[PDB]
Amino acid sequence: MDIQKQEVREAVELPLTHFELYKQIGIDPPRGVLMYGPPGCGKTMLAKAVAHHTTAAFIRVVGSEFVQKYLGEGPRMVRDVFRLAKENAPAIIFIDEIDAIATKRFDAQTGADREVQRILLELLNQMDGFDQNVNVKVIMATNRADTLDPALLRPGRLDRKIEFPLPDRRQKRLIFSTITSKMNLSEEVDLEDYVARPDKISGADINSICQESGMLAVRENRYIVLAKDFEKAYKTV
Amino acid sequence: GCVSNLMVCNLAYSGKLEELKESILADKSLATRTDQDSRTALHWACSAGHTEIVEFLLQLGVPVNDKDDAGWSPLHIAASAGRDEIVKALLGKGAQVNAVNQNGCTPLHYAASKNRHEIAVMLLEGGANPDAKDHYEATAMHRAAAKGNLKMIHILLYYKASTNIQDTEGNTPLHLACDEERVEEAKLLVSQGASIYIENKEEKTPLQVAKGGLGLILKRMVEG
Amino acid sequence: LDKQIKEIKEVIELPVKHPELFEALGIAQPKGVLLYGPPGTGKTLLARAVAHHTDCTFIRVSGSELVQKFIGEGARMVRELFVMAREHAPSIIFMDEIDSIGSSRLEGGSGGDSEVQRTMLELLNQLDGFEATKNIKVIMATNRIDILDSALLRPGRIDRKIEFPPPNEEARLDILKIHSRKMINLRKIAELMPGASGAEVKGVCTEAGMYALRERRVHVTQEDFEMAVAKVMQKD
């Protein structure tokens, strides 16, 4: 890494205070950060790291929070989160899995998805009008970008495309130590074959895999997790 | 409270000298009793790293080759734990230097990967096999070259160890050293006889794996 | 980009502010100009910069792929774009997505690009065929032999030829003045960093805002741009 945490650091959390900086420095840093990586679910460890480092609100919303038979409450929700973002604290909006609301469709029998993507174009014009004197920081990541529309990835909207196929061995040691340091550890719990093999096989959301190993240690029969739940959690999930 | 079901394992873990000697000298059967993890007082005694307790257990004549349900020998415990004197006692009693655990690893993998100089020199001195491969077909040079253990690779090359062990994918330890941008391990292994022609199943050369012009000094050190 | 703005003011800015030159000079309407060369900088930032000084909109054709799969099945659809151009009279048209060095097969790429060549043929046949409103022009952008094919499709009747100028001295001073009027000594730093592109100075500013923001300086000093020169010389 060393460029992901630095670019997201100075482009996300440094402008998160004294709003006058956005126009004191001139060109406001782009707020659009598009993560990738379809092996695992992912998109959670960094949202938690920001949720613990930065002390602010976080109004997370699943990508299908407004996909209903109605059309309202869209600009009401995003407008209320905008006005509280520029009113109380610039909460970071987490819009994950935009492929459900970004799928191509020409037929008019499914005019609900086309209608809510026309609302997505309405708020697209809103964020077009939200480039001057506004407190907004919306992170938008997904697992597949081959089906994403060109209007979303247009320059000026999403100017950061960070790729994360696999973390390096040092980031493996850190991503395993940050979760095994709190949980029950032992001498059989080793990071050598688990730094070698998970570096060969492509796998994201390693923290979620260790949490699944916690679901394999939730029996309370064995007080300390061992290599059986680790390798079994590797071959299963 | 208690981290283990057997009391002798909580005593061997908590370092209760006089209480472990009172319990074992009061009942010799408690020494070799098995727990749910198929471990005895020797496994936890070598785990905590106490000299007098493992010298009492090994003094009475506890089987040094007692494996758990997976196959974790006590030498993997003293080597992987990072305890010099415990490895001195286990090697002093005749432990298997090439024991096979669940994944077929040897104490040279865990000892060498943890950058333990004295444990690696003392294990290899007793007659350890440098070319011993686990179930994943990986030796200790993949891990030592993956974590940046330069001096460990060097002292492994003191005992005439091979540097062209193919992994389960086919990557040599040079691919794992150059993958992490280890310039010193690349110049050392290539300067000592590393074969760059051996490819993996992905058909990737060590020059293409490394970036930033490192393949240029790789081929430069190969031709030169 | 001194040659592009100096040669573009009388081609684009003629129907904008001084239409009397059409009668007092006896000249016709320039239908457009094709920009050939390395698409480093100035293909879109300058079209939208001059298009921003004109306060006009920007309409794209998007003759590349994905239009036959995302938008139904696909169609020609240039007359509706000419009605939208009729409503928004100041409509600047420019090809940017198809501008690539990959269209050099001459077997299938000459056809796939020849569909856009047909699009600009019929656009030059409607524009050259009749003129209802002003400020209707098209700008081409290609890198491969298709430039010589554009010369094969423009028989010297209504066309303009402007080559991509290198980052000359005045070509950097004037583009830094025009790009500086929207927002320290910019002259000497505009003199002491020759490069390969036109917006390289803007790249120096973007690579300097993180040091003016890191050091919390009230004004960008010469040392900040001096570091940004090393930054662009390490990224480039």
Which residue from C227, C229, C172, C235 is spatially nearest to C199, judged by alpha carbons? C172
Query: Helices A206-215 and A169-180 meet at what angle, rounded to 10?
Result: 30
| Distance of residue B6 Cα from the nearest chain A Cα, in angstroms | 13
* C213 interaction partners in chain A (CB closer than 8 Å): 10, 14, 21, 25
Cβ contact, residue pair A192, B4, below 8 Å: no
Residue with tokens 């879109």: C44
Residue C12 to residue C175: CA distance in whole angstroms: 17
Structure tokens given for B185 = 């391990």
Which residue from A136, A129, A128 is spatially nearest to A19, judged by alpha carbons? A136
Among partner residues B4, B77, B146, which is closest to A196 by beta-carbon distance? B146
Residue with tokens 């340091």: A181
* C212 interaction partners in chain A (CB closer than 8 Å): 25
A108: nearest CA in chain C?
Answer: C72
Structure tokens given for C36 = 């050939």
The set of residues, in sequence order, having a beta carbon less than 8 Å from that of A116 and lying 6+ positions away, is A66, A67, A71, A74, A101
| Distance of residue A88 Cα from the nearest chain B Cα, in angstroms | 45
Structure tokens given for A89 = 């604290």
Half-sphere exposure of A65 (CA within 13 A, CB side): 18
Residue C62 to residue A142: CA distance in whole angstroms: 25
A21: nearest CA in chain C?
Answer: C213
Residue C183's Cβ-count burial label (10 Å; 0-12, 13-18, 19+) is exposed
Q: Is A137 helix (H, G, I), strand (E, B) or coil?
A: strand
Strand partners, A161: A34
Among partner residues C70, C72, C209, which is closest to A26 by beta-carbon distance? C209
| Distance of residue C14 Cα from the nearest chain A Cα, in angstroms | 30
Other Cβ atoms within 10 Å of B86 Cβ, number: 27
Cβ contact, residue pair A25, C183, below 8 Å: no
| Distance of residue A225 Cα from the nearest chain B Cα, in angstroms | 11
Query: Helices B117-125 and B84-93 meet at what angle, rounded to 10?
Result: 10
Residue B85 to residue B46: CA distance in whole angstroms: 10
* B:4-63 residues touching chain A, CB 8 A cutoff: 4, 36-37, 47
Residue B166 to residue C230: CA distance in whole angstroms: 42
User: B73 touching A, CB under 8 A?
Assistant: no
Q: Are A16 and A22 in contact (CB under 8 A)?
A: no
* Residue C32 is assigned to a ligand binding site: no
Task: List phi, psi (to 5°) of A95.
Answer: -110, 95
Q: Which of A170, A176, A200 would you mutate first to test chain B, the one with the most B CBs within 10 A?
A: A200
Other Cβ atoms within 10 Å of C41 Cβ, number: 21
Residue A232 to residue A228: CA distance in whole angstroms: 6
Helices (H), A28-110: 45-53, 74-85
**Resolution stated for this PDB structure, in Å:** 7.9
The set of residues, in sequence order, having a beta carbon less than 8 Å from that of C64 and lying 6+ positions away, is C97, C98
User: B113 touching A, CB under 8 A?
Assistant: yes
The set of residues, in sequence order, having a beta carbon less than 8 Å from that of A165 and lying 6+ positions away, is A37, A202
Cβ contact, residue pair C69, A27, below 8 Å: no
Q: Which of A3, A171, A192, A199 would you mutate first to test chain B, the one with the most B CBs within 10 A?
A: A192
| Distance of residue B182 Cα from the nearest chain A Cα, in angstroms | 12
- Cα Rg, chain C, nearest whole Å: 20
Which residue from A175, A141, A177, A181 is spatially nearest to A161, judged by alpha carbons? A141
Measured CA to CA in angstroms, residue A185 lies from A111, A180, A224, A234, B113 at distances of 54, 6, 6, 18, 19
Write out the binding residues of A for ATP.
37-44
Q: Is C144 helix (H, G, I), strand (E, B) or coil?
A: coil
